[PDB]
Write a protein that binds this DNA or RNA. Sequence first.
RNA 1: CGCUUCUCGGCCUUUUGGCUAAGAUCAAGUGUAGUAUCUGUUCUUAUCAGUUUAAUAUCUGAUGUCCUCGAGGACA
RNA 2: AUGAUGUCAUACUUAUCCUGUC
Lengths: 28, 75, 48, 100, 116, 183, 111
Amino acid sequence: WKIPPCISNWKTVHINENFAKLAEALYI
Amino acid sequence: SSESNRDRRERLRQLALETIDINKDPYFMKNHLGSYECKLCLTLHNNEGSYLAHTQGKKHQTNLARRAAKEAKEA
Amino acid sequence: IPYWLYKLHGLNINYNCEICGNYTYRGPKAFQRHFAEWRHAHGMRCLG
Amino acid sequence: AKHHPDLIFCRKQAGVAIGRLCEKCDGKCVICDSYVRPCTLVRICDECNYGSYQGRCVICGGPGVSDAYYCKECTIQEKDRDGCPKIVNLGSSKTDLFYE
Amino acid sequence: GGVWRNTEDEILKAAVMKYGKNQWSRIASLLHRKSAKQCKARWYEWLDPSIKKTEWSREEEEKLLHLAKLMPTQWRTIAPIIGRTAAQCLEHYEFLLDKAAQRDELEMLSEARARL
Amino acid sequence: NRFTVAELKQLVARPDVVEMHDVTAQDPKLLVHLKATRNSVPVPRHWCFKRKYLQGKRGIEKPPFELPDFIKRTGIQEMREALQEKEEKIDIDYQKLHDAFFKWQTKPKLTIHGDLYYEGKEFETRLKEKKPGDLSDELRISLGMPVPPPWLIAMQRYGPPPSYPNLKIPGLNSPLYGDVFGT
Amino acid sequence: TRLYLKAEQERQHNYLKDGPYITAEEAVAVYTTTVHWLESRRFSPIPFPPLSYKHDTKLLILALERLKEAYSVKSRLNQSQREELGLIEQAYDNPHEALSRIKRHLLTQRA
RNA sequence: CGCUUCUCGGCCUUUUGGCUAAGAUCAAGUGUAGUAUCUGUUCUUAUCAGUUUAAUAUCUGAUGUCCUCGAGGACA
RNA sequence: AUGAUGUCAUACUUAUCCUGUC
């Protein structure tokens, strides 16, 4: 139960198959 | 202008001294005219960035292996 | 292989000191320092 | 000098024409290029002062107002008993400054 | 401008390590060559400690090749997704992959094209 | 077309000044005559060096400034140090500085006309040849003898030194005042 | 401002996280409708930058005039705005070099 | 004689009282000559001749035939 | 371990110099 230091202040999958399926359909 | 440049040079010298104290550089030496001089590289440094860049070219730390072998025969 | 460093330092230069027990030197400065040395003076004292 | 290392002097025969200095180069010496200790006046050559070449500055070459003099440090070093130090050539000075 | 010399890069790295990250005006007052936005862009592009400046492999090349066709533009969106995150190594790798691999009547026609 | 060094040394009357680079000149006789003059000075040692006589003192750290006693006895250095410590005025005196500049003026240690500046010129503090019978003060202090130095008691037994045969030291064959116990 | 930028942040991470685009089939129909409409009107394609154009320098002066008249009006500055005004003045001093810069950027730098 | 806990002392870390829009911001030098100091990269070449140098250094020129991959083998 | 040539920044000096024109 110890407080650590605090110096930060200024003082999912990230991909979807629907986008690729839309891009390939637009290319076709 | 000139006073702002003097304050910026003093802040840069203080940041260079803090970086040399944090990294514990044993080769950084100060001159008598406001410049740095490398003891291990045996060369001069024009600015604070010159002594802070002498870590890729002329690596004198790798040349200390002969002195380490002469001081101690064992590994 | 420090070829440029040995060329700038004066290495692989033909030199010989006959007074210092007919020894050979790899440079002109080494030949000048070998002519006035302990072995050269010892050979000069042993020669008379 | 100082202001110009590629400038060459005339070093001609000394005449009776007294040298002069421009208003922008007033007080500056010819050889020593200093501002203190004037001891000897400046004498110009005969060909260097004729018609439109008379009344011009020796160092500056502009409109001379006051008479030029030599420094005492150049007088004691026998640097004032040489020829007429008229600036003949003008290189690497006031050439690119005219374009800007 | 922005030549990004090595002595300036070491000073920028020391200013980022000493002053901070979210203070761009404090880091630009000790360089006298670039502004705060240029210093922040350099710190996010080349002076970042998490930037993988080397080790270009075939898995990342296959990831970038299977992403440039789904999105032709917006290379900055695929910068952190591919893993390079430098916003210029992706375009350089795409240019290297493109240069190394280079070395009603219409329907009535097609209708009779199958019937003939 | 060029004579050897032995032929140039045998022909010269003073062969203790000939060098190895003098044979490559256009007139060795005139160079040997000019190098053996009475009040001539030799050339610098940077004629063959490649450090340009100013790159050898890289790691040598020296003091900032060695002020004289005539400036240190005026109190201006302490006032300047106090002003530098306050910045990081005095008005002590006006006639004391004139007295230290005129009456309390110390003549500095000059050099000879042939005393040219060497390369290092700081680690070779050579001084005449303090020989047998003559010593410095302090080493007297370490020795601790009140006004012979006591190993010239053993220069009685074992004999006069081979190294300095001409020797005389007090009380033995040399029949002494202050420091100097032998000549 | 901080709230609406956070909102745009959430929506952007969403629209990339889910790939939830604009319904690819309807997208294809829209692209086809556009291609057909443009062909029916028979519009020519827009030519890329004619390097020696009679249009070029005149267009560049007009655009730089609008950019100057907006970004500088009267007696204010920054440092960013200062560099902007300075590059504007350099363009109005060496115009063909600036057209060269613009053409090189527009054909090269896709960032 | 050994062991566990508790207390007292000799002592070897760090350590600003808050919140509002990270509280809000910027940070100019011109040219002619010239020097210095950093970094990076290149010569295991053998011999001779000449140029050149204080001496080096440097520069400039070349030597048998066949096969195989400068080296090896064969022949004259 | 100096030195060598070399593309490339960085400091320093010259009391360098800003109304020059047909």
